[PDB]
Every structure is written in C-alpha cells, then in structure tokens.
C-alpha cells in the first residue's frame, strides 16, 4: 500500500 | 559540485525544493554529503526528500510503461521501459553509494544509524520492484537485511511514538506485503507498531503528539486496506 | 536522436507524455523535426505540448525564486535564480532554433504557418519575461512581430472559430496585457476575438463548438480579471 | 492571466 511520503521537508 | 561551498549547497538545496526542483536538489545535496562531514538532522531530511522525489517520479513513469507494456504482450515500449528503469536504477545506485561512502559508518547516534540504514532498505526496496529473477533474491535481502538492522537499533534505543521508528515499520512492512509476498508478517508488524505507539503517545508535547499519530494513521490506512 | 527511426521518436514522446516525462518527450520530438520532415497536425501538437511543460516548470521555478530573491533585496538566491534561468533560456533558444530551421520556411498550410508562428511569440514572450533593459526591447519586439504574422495569416485563412486562431489570439492578449503594457489592447482583442467567435459557432458540429467554446471560456475569465 | 494551458495533447 503506502509507505512514507516523505517527499516534503 | 566540489567547488562549491557546504553551507551555499543546503542552502540551495532548500530553495530548490521551494521552486519544486527535485533534482537539482539532490544534486545539491549529494555535493553537500560529498565534502565528507556528517549531516545534521534537517540535512538529513533534505537528503532524503530530494531524492524520493526524484526516483518518486521514475517509480510511476516507470509503472505507467510496464502497465502499457503488459498489454502489448515494436520494440520501443520496453526499450523505453528499460531506459526509464536503467535512470532509476542509476539513482538508486547513487543513493545507496552516498550511503556506503561514507554516512553510515560514521554514523553512531541512533537517530542518524536508524535513518541511514531505513533509506538503504528503501532504495533496495526500489530497486527490487524492477528487478527479474536471482538477481532479485539478492536484491531482496540486501532491503531485509537494512530494515532488520534499522528495526533491531530502533528498538532498543527510540521511544515506540518516534517519528523514524515509525515510518521505518511502515517501510518495512510494505516491504513485507509487497516485495517479499508475507502479507501476514506486513500486517503483524503494522498492527504491533500501531499499538505500542498508542501506548506511549501520553507521553507527548502536542507537537509531538501531531507528528507520530500522523505516521500512525498511515500504518491505519493500510492496515485498513490489508484486512 | 539521430539514430532513432522517426516513428519510433513519434510513438516514444506519446509514451513519454503517458509517463508524464516531459523532457524526455521533447528530446524526442526535437529528434524527430531534427529528421527534416514536415510535421503533421498531430506531431506539431506533440512537439507544442512537450516544450510548453519543460518551459512551464522552468518559468515557474524561476517565479518562485525571483520572489525570494526580490524579497532579500549571500549570492546563493541570485546565483541559483541565474542557474534557472539560463536553462529556460536555452531551452526556448533551442525550439526558436527549431521553428528556425526549418519549421517555419517549410510551413505553407494556414494551419502549419500559423500554429509555428505562435510558437515563435510564445517563445519570445517567456525570453521577455526574464530579460532585462534594452535587450528586453529587442526581445519584445521579436515576439511581437511572430504573432502579428500569425494573426495576420489566421484572419485572412481561417474562421473566427478555430482554436488555433483562438489560441494565437488569447496568447497574444496577454503578451499585450503582461510584457508590452499594454492591458487596453489586451482587453480590446480579447473582446473581439470572442464576439466574432461567438457570432460563428452556428457553424459548428458539437465537438468542434466544443473545442472552440473551451477557449472562448479562457478568453472570457482573463476579460474578467482584467476588468 | 492565462494563457493557453497547452501542457496536454
Ligand atoms: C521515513 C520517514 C520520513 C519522514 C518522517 S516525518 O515524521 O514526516 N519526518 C520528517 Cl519529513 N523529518 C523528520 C525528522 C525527525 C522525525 O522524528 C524524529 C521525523 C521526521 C518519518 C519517517
Ligand atoms: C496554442 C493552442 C494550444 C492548444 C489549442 S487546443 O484547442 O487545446 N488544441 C490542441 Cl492541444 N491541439 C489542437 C489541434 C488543432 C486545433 O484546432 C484546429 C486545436 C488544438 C489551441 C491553441
Ligand atoms: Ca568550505
Ligand atoms: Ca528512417
Ligand atoms: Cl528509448
Ligand atoms: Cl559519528
Ligand atoms: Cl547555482
Ligand atoms: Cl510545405
């Protein structure tokens, strides 16, 4: 499914 | 970007992910963790968003031309499927260098051991998506091994609410569900994760409190979408 | 590009724009004009699209940093701003050089002649956006001059209603209204150019008043925001 | 204000 975004920082 | 000094490349690293220039921003900030010294949390953190929005953006290019490719079954679909694949794998491959050369073995503190060692099994996880075969046997492990060795760190050393403990049991069991075909380990690991953080938030500062039941809601969603 | 069929180049930038890989589809249909052909209506539109989001991403980076740059007045903002924008630059100097060798002294059809032409003010229009004193004139005046021919052409050669005579003329508005300072012309084109299509959609099968209603509606909100 | 989108085609 949905790992971290993590595309924002 | 040898000729440039550290401190001008994170700072051009965050005005290139206000303009929305991801890979000039991983550019940026391979020079800054290129000039050898360690990096802080926030340069961390730009480190890693400059990145997963760069190979963000191949991983769906590249499932757009797989799906079309799939169908199909000229040459130019998968020869274009294969150049998209062949970058990605290229910055994958950077990634994990940058890694290897030399930030986590001058990683000591917890904190900076944990997030290193989630990203190496995140780009291993990318590269395992598009890889066939053997090759990805050993792929696969090389993203178990990371994860375990990240889990293993976290356990003993981090809170069960902190924010990399959390994202890296999201990453890990979408690992699970994903790569490694053990959706019941994915769930396992989703749900005890979820659980011990629900625990431990009475422990939290409301800005805390925000940042870890954010990431707990992901680990709910897809738990959500697994059961 | 050289080595590459010219279909395939074709049939790779229609992948390329599934993908959403807008650089990559203008390599390829910067190799395909660059076989000498003349382009069909189909190609031609590839060829706009592609360019239009490599320039469209460029030119709002270069906003965003143009604000913080105006705002802080180190050399990092301007020296990064002057990075982008030399990279817009050269990607409009690169389809100018195209629609100059040899799209536009190929192009003898209305259809060709014209949509080629408001590319050339299009692409000056985005060099006057960044361009500086004098030089800004010459520039504003190159864009200026392409899209008079084009108008001209498309008022003696095709209907009030074709989107392409629509597009020229909404984009020429606004190269009145935002670089020549000129907002009464603006708005006096817009008005016209939407009253004399309005007057001829009775033509008109559904789908294309559909095509020609959709500008139209675009004209309509910049007269909107403009009075 | 705006002109032609034209990032789709
Ligand atoms: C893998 C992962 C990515 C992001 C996050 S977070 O909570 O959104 N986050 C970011 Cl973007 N930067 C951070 C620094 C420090 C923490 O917690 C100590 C979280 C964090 C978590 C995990
Ligand atoms: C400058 C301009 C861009 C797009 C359009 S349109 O109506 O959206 N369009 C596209 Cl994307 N392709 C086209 C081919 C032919 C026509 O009309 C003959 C319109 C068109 C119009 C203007
Ligand atoms: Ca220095
Ligand atoms: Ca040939
Ligand atoms: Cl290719
Ligand atoms: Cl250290
Ligand atoms: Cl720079
Ligand atoms: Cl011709």
Known sequence: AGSIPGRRS | ?227
């Open chain 2, 1 to 227: 970007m040898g000729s440039m000094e550290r401190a001008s490349l994170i700072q051009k690293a965050k005005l290139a992910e206000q303009a929305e220039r991801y890979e000039d921003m991983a550019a940026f900030m391979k020079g800054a963790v290129e000039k050898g010294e360690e990096l802080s949390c926030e340069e961390r953190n730009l480190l890693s968003v400059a990145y997963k929005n760069v190979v963000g953006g191949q991983r769906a290019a590249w499932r757009v031309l797989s799906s079309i490719e799939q169908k199909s079954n000229g040459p130019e679909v998968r020869e274009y499927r294969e150049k998209v694949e062949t970058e990605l794998q290229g910055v994958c491959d950077t990634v994990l260098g940058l890694l290897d050369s030399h930030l986590i073995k001058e990683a000591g503190d917890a904190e900076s051991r944990v997030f290193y060692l989630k990203m190496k099994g995140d780009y291993y996880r990318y590269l395992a998506e598009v890889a066939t075969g053997d090759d990805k046997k050993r792929i696969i492990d090389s993203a178990r091994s990371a994860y375990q060795e990240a889990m293993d760190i976290s356990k003993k050393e981090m809170p069960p609410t902190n924010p990399i403990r959390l994202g890296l049991a999201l990453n890990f069991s979408v690992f699970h569900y994903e790569i490694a075909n053990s959706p019941e380990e994915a769930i396992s690991l989703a749900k005890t994760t979820f659980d011990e953080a629900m625990a431990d938030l009475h422990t939290l500062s409301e800005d805390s409190y925000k940042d870890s039941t954010l990431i707990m809601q992901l680990l709910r969603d897809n738990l959500t979408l697994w059961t």
